Symmetry: D2
Subunit: 260 residues, 4 copies
């Protein structure tokens, strides 16, 4: 066999046109998988989706999806199974991170973050239960964060709640889905260089990198490669994990402990 | 002079008329604190609140509160500060735990659990920010659970998400509130004997106890005594903790590891 | 009386200085009988006199080398002979010398494991009989954020030892539960000790700037949590690792420390 | 451009002749790496070399090694560098797990477990520092366990201490080694089907399997495939992780929570 073969997989990546989701979609496309790249409006980035279509032997398409809308989740799952004939890997990756301190955070700001990041995760997994189950080797991969499960950051207590909520959901979902052969795992990115963050300059970037033992920010494909590994047949006994990808950022006790 | 003195405290306990919340209110009442016992409908259990009033030197009262309603939270905090002249301890305890497997869980079932358990926790803390800050020794204590942060239980993936969400919220909120002198901590109860559980008979209770190294189910005052400790001046350096109270239930590797 | 400790008999290892002395002090104030253990007879008579007047319990000093199992047995016997009981043990003794991974000698690694890990195991083992006889026995381990939570270049052996204590706890809590003994751990962050005061206020303020609470902790912060865990009221709490750090381990980066 | 290419790696696997260590060595051999398998006894060394030499394009050697002995560790690293011209992956996998209840455990029983399981790990990594650093892409992978970091098991408090100690070591070692390009990670196997468990018979194995959501015990290659992933260039931003491979064993709250 080829080790870590993903060429027979059919993958859904929510929030797949940008940032971390795009890194995840890129890796699956290079591995030869069918990949559905979902977005609120896929046509805004259709050249990205077409480019992914050139990277491997699988079929790559865009799908429209509002993750917070349970009907939209159900339509997208249906579309993907009609498209590929299967859906055996789900990367529930979509999420938002607007800023609000506790003394000003409105009920609407709190609800928006919980609707997208928590309900959107639950609805995405629920919509895909039947094809995940039918596959015999189903894989659920959640994009969480260090913020919430591990760290705090003033202005992001709702974001942190939402990212920790994904893990609480996972610890039960993994049990519900295990007898059907489905694993359920989470990836917790640290500081990842995205398209947004690049247009801020080498002084702001390397400033952030100074707190990271590895000495640089991560990339979207760092997240993508772990997701790819988790989706393989070879990872079928790994479930309920929360794996941090952060260049060692959360380890140092204090600024003086960052560098030997 | 007196170690762990709480006789000068003014405490709000949400969901305080029943179960764990009643255990927390009871301990604070015995310790001589002012205690506001909050409930969806306090009059249903006014005899409980009256009895608490006899346990110590503090003023004990009922307060109506729908934690999922941000206006209700604001009204209750105003009522409590008017009543006591202060509000320096908040036990954000209210929570529900209806059952729903992932294959049947409706958007409405998911939303209700997140609204009460997560939003209710956030709104309660937010409503109390001004008096917590004014005290200089503010205390926030969250009632979470082992289910979600530690364990899973088929039928409670939404409950687990909500209980883990409380911790993600805490890890940022503790940072936001620390310079104002406020600590933010959580208690994670295991299997606690409440009224409901009592009715189900000694043989069903003894059956659950067999998985617990300590050999019995906990009581609501086990939770209350930890909350009381966390509220003391003596606990002013403890923040952001998630402390499990479970008689060692989460420790054994398997059934044969439960007893030596 | 809520949280009554006046009927307790407590052994505190490394009890004559810093965190250990903070633990001993709180138990003494609470009215418990307290035995402080150390290697130095001079530090013993001095701390014993200090603690002796704080409450209604008796205070003794005990010579102890925690890395020696025979010395541990002697200490438990000495404590039981003096108090008639031994129902709380604070396994607190530990060392923290620096050694980078590329220079760390077998002697440096072995010493840290012998004192911090083996010393913890031998202390608990020596106390098993009186802990069991009490019906309400309490074991409290002094661990650290370093190892279980954080890393710090120079302290990989120390971190290994502090994490080892928790691995030990998670099983010991189960073996001892049916005897009525709880087994818990406290993980101090940055606590103000004598060696830190000597660094001066600029150095201390610099450390405090990474801590949300805005200051370093106190030995009695550890003492008060140990006292709570020893009460009858904490009888359903076992196998916990509780961090006491003013939120130091929470911020994501320097910019996240202050709102 | 092969994703997850390991064909240029030179790998030392301590305790590599049996059980989990052999599963690790086998996966790396299949992926085309040079593999040195180490054991305390010289007995199995020639045979494992002929057997694994067959599996891929790399070379396989057997190394006699007492991990508790610093000089033996230094000799092993030298042997590997002489044979392969490099040493860029070390799997510090050797460990022992004899039983000893707290009330009978001798100084000798405690010391032996700490010497092999903890000191053996430190000395292995230390002996490999120079070639790990020279490679530019060094990888350290520790075999820990759920027992210690997560669970308790009467009779294994020394074992659990040793397995947790590896992780305390890791959280600092990962910081010290990061600027040299070396990642340091740990795998925590749950219940893996080994020879000894097979010899107990199917009823015993089935009994164990009923506590596992996945419905079966794992295999040594489950550990080996994760080790292989961690060793890739693609996992270069992952450090300080403790990843559990257990089929969901540590998730259920109680026996009734294992199956939905
Ligand atoms: K293609
Ligand atoms: K009263
Ligand atoms: K006295
Ligand atoms: K070969």
């Amino acid at each position: 066999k080829v080790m870590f073969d993903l060429s027979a997989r059919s993958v859904l990546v929510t929030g797949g046109t940008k940032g971390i989701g795009r890194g995840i979609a890129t890796v699956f496309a290079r591995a030869g998988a069918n990949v559905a790249v979902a977005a609120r409006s896929p046509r805004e980035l259709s050249s990205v989706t077409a480019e992914l279509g050139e990277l491997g032997a699988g079929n790559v398409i865009g799908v429209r999806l509002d993750v917070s809308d349970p009907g939209s989740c159900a339509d997208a799952a249906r579309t993907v199974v009609d498209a590929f004939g299967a859906l055996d890997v789900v990367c529930a990756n979509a999420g938002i991170f607007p800023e609000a301190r506790l003394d000003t955070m409105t009920p609407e700001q709190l609800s928006e973050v919980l609707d997208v990041n928590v309900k959107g995760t639950v609805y995405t997994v629920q919509a895909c239960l039947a094809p995940l189950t039918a596959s015999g080797r189903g894989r659920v991969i959640l994009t969480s964060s260090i913020t919430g499960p591990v760290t705090g950051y003033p202005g992001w207590s709702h974001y942190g709640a939402s990212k920790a909520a994904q893990l609480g959901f996972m610890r039960t979902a993994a049990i519900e889905l295990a007898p059907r052969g489905v694993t359920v795992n989470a990836i917790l990115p640290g500081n990842i260089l995205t398209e947004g963050l690049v247009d801020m300059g080498e002084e702001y970037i390397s400033g952030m990198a100074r707190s990271i033992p590895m000495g640089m920010l991560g990339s979207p494909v760092d997240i993508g490669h772990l997701a790819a590994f988790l989706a393989t047949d070879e990872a079928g006994y790994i479930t309920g994990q929360a794996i941090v990808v952060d260049g060692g950022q959360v380890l140092p006790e204090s600024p003086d402990a960052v560098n030997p």
